[PDB]
Amino acid sequence: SGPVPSRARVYTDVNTHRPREYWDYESHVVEWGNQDDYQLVRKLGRGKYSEVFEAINITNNEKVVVKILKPVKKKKIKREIKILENLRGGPNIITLADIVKDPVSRTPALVFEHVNNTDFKQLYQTLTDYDIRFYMYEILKALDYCHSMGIMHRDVKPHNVMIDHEHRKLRLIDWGLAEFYHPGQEYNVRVASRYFKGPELLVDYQMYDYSLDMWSLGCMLASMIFRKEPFFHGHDNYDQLVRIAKVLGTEDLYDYIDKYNIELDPRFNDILGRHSRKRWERFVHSENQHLVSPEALDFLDKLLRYDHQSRLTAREAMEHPYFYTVVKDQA
Numbered sequence: 001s002g003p004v005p006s007r008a009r010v011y012t013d014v015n016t017h018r019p020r021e022y023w024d025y026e027s028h029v030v031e032w033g034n035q036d037d038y039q040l041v042r043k044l045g046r047g048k049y050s051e052v053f054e055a056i057n058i059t060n061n062e063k064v065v066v067k068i069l070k071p072v073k074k075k076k077i078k079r080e081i082k083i084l085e086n087l088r089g090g091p092n093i094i095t096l097a098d099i100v101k102d103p104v105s106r107t108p109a110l111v112f113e114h115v116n117n118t119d120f121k122q123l124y125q126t127l128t129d130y131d132i133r134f135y136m137y138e139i140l141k142a143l144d145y146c147h148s149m150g151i152m153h154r155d156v157k158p159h160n161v162m163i164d165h166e167h168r169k170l171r172l173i174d175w176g177l178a179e180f181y182h183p184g185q186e187y188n189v190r191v192a193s194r195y196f197k198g199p200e201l202l203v204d205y206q207m208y209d210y211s212l213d214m215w216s217l218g219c220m221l222a223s224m225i226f227r228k229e230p231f232f233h234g235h236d237n238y239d240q241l242v243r244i245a246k247v248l249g250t251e252d253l254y255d256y257i258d259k260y261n262i263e264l265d266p267r268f269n270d271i272l273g274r275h276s277r278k279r280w281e282r283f284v285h286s287e288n289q290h291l292v293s294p295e296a297l298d299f300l301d302k303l304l305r306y307d308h309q310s311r312l313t314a315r316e317a318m319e320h321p322y323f324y325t326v327v328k329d330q331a
């Protein structure tokens, strides 16, 4: 008869109450600066939609990052631009500094603030239980902010979180998959990295909301405190749901399906099976116990839920006991 609809249980109407121009990005007009103000120094990394360079602004001699965009639909470029401008200034959101086009190739590029990225190779062994709480809280500062601004990020993952540990500075980057939230809108489920896709993505439930981001955050936290990168190591989109089902159990998954009347792809009909809801203690071992704790496991369990309505919000997460220590130190 159809899927049951869903509404975000926070920030539901934030966008309706704004002027059309806030979220109607398709009609945004963009001011292309001259790429010749910036000279590229070196390639800092590529990806599916872009390549990133360290660059220098020749007018003020300042270090900077230029993100040249591989061809995407014109709407998506305006979308990312509109969203960085609405989010500009917000806590731990990367700052868009300029929007330039190349003179000859006419290909567009966004110019961002430079962040001395701390080497994550040596950062994986000098990570204390406090540092994970501290930097997890910084991510929620940014997630709660953009959720409160009506924007879901949809691509939270390690490669999209930068840390300058020297100065305890964190930045949430790549907003090219982010969208505005609009009650009742149906979204594209083919988003995010495969290991961070939320169950609502894998069962093709299009009416999701900010809580999508909390699942991803739960996948990161789990890989951190258990030192298992990635925590749900599926071999494709279908098996990714099975890898989740082997940890969360099937009983809750089929409950979720019935609650929202989601019709399950028949490809799933013979690979899910019957699996119990495991206990988090299974994943705890000598090399990772120094980060696992009763609070962390409680906080993790309240993030990784099938039903997107029941995951904590970003604001609820900050008020969890897991962060009681970093919240007092910020005083």
Ligand SMILES: O=C(O)c1ccc2c(c1)nc(NCCCCCCNCc1ccc(-c3ccccc3)c(Cl)c1)c1ccncc12
Pocket: 044, 045, 052, 065, 067, 094, 112, 113, 114, 115, 116, 117, 120, 123, 131, 132, 133, 135, 136, 157, 158, 159, 160, 161, 162, 163, 173, 174, 175, 220, 224
């Ligand atoms: O496209 C954009 O908008 C954009 C904007 C600006 C920049 C950009 C892209 N790309 C840059 N270079 C790409 C490098 C890859 C990121 C490295 C991943 N970082 C691991 C990592 C560590 C620790 C944790 C963690 C989590 C929880 C608790 C403790 C630690 C996590 Cl989760 C991940 C860049 C460089 C310099 N300046 C600006 C930008």
